[PDB]
Every structure is written in C-alpha cells, then in structure tokens.
C-alpha cells in the first residue's frame, strides 16, 4: 500500500564519515553539516560528493527552532547584550536556546546556514524543532495559532529559499507534525517527507497505543499524499541480549506496517555512530 521510496535510512549527527557511509548500504543519510558542529569542521563539497557518487542521498540537519552556542552564527555579544528573540536555555539540551523564530534576525541566520548547506552539495534539509511553536504557546508569549502560523510560514520561506537555488531539494521536518492542524494544505504539499522520533518507543520503553495512533493520523495522511516518513526510535540498548534484539525487530515491524521507514538508534541518544545491527540494519 505504502509509499516507501527508500529501503532504509541513517541518522548520525556526530563523527559521520562519508567514506564509511558511502559503502554502508544506507540509501539516505541525515548528518550534521560539520564533523564536530563548528565552522572549522564544515564538510567540504568533496567530502559530500563521495556520498553522492556512491548513490547515497545526504541530507543536512538544521535546527530552526533553537540557537546552538557552538555554531558559526553564535556571537559572544549575545551573553552581554542579549537579543529579544534569544530565549532561555533548554533544560534537556545544554547549549541550545529557544528562539523566537519569527523575528527577522533569526530567519536570516537560518537562511545563511542554508546557504552554506547548499554550497556543500547536500540534497535535502532536515529541520529540527518545528515543535518550538508548542514551546512558545505554552509559555504564553504568543497564541498557539500565531505560533503555528509563524512556524508554517517560516518553513514555507525556507522552502522558497533553497528551491530558488536547487529546485529538487528535499525538505523534511522533524516532529511537530500536529502543526498540520493549522495548515491549509500548502505545507503538506511543500515537504518531501516528515521525520519523527519516539513513535512506538521512548528509548527502550513502548508507548501507549493511543499516543502512537494519534501521531500516525498525521503521518498516514501525508503518506497517502506521496510523502515519505522516516522513523527513528532510540531502542537499541547496545547489548545483543534477547530482550533488546526482540525490541528492535518489534519496532522494525511496527514501523513498516504503517509506512514508516525505521532506524533503530542507541538509547543514549548521542547519534555518534553509524549503528549497524547484523542482518537487520541495513536490511538483508
């Protein structure tokens, strides 16, 4: 039934090696735009073309809902003279900061990041912290509809920007899929696909059946429209215990039965390795 145009995928945000990935057998790889996150680690065009040459589609992670204090755009002056749009540090991810993504200064930061990513030769972008719209709504800073509309429009503007230069660029948001409650249909046509974390499992622990089914409502609808879905659940505890590999198999089977292409990732959340599991990932 399902639209499933990739056989597998890779999510690796630290220590990604183009050579390793080239000959792994993963068809699409979502990595960072730099080897350590910093400006000086930026992959060269050559390093990215290794993957392209091998038939892998490389895609760049870009966080559009938080500022990250190690990136090329961060300024020392923000500590002493803090912009309005720069907010509190994320308790769960030190060095990340919620931003008022609707302010021009932020949007233009992100556009300047997409500029580097286009020049490097990446073939999609993977957009994290769509869910910042929920954060600001919940802080009571702006209304939820206002937040949702602003984030939708920002993703639309992101799409316009990169497709002016690279018309077939893939666009994959991560989470915040319920933002589609406020879409008129344009966002759902504009993306190539959507990615989610924690659909069947929160690390090693399975989720209530209704929570899962709620998310799937959005994803199923997007699948029927020709958009692929990448799942990543953080299910591999690192052992080759029975309990562990049973869980991996269970996650793989639930993913594929609902049109989600799975990647079982380490329970540590570090996404620091290529993460192969003998005759499961990649698949036979």
Author numbering: 29 to 312
Which sentences did the original study use to describe this structure?
Endo-galactosaminidases are an underexplored family of enzymes involved in the degradation of galactosaminogalactan (GAG) and other galactosamine-containing cationic exopolysaccharides produced by fungi and bacteria. The TIM-barrel core structure with fully conserved active-site residues and a negatively charged substrate crevice is conserved among all the families. The putative active-site residues (Asp156/Glu225 for TmGH191, Asp323/Glu391 for Env-GH191 and Asp157/Glu225 for FsGH114) overlap well with the experimentally verified nucleophile and general acid/base Asp189/Glu247 in Ega3, Asp196/Glu222 in Sph3 and Asp160/Glu223 in PelAH.
We could not detect any binding, or enzymatic cleavage of the GAG oligomers, for the T. maritima enzyme, which raises the question as to whether the T. maritima enzyme is an endo-galactosaminidase or whether GAG is not a substrate for this family. The TmGH191 crystals all showed a varying degree of twinning. The structure is composed of tightly packed trimers stacked on each other along their common pseudo-threefold axis. A pair of adjacent trimers form the asymmetric unit, with the two trimers having slightly different orientations (11.5° rotation around the common axis). The stacks of trimers pack into a sparse honeycomb-like structure with wide wells around the pseudo-63 axis and a solvent content of 82.5%. Sph3 has a rather less charged surface due to its activity on neutral GlcNAcylated GAG. A closer inspection shows that the substrate crevice is partially blocked in ‘apo’ TmGH191, especially over the active site via the loop between βi2 and βi3, with Trp121 bridging the active site and blocking access towards the putative −1 subsite. While no distinct density for a bound carbohydrate was observed, difference density in the substrate-binding crevice of TmGH191 suggests that something has bound, although it could not be conclusively modelled. Some flexibility in the side chain of Trp121 was noted when comparing the native and soaked structures.
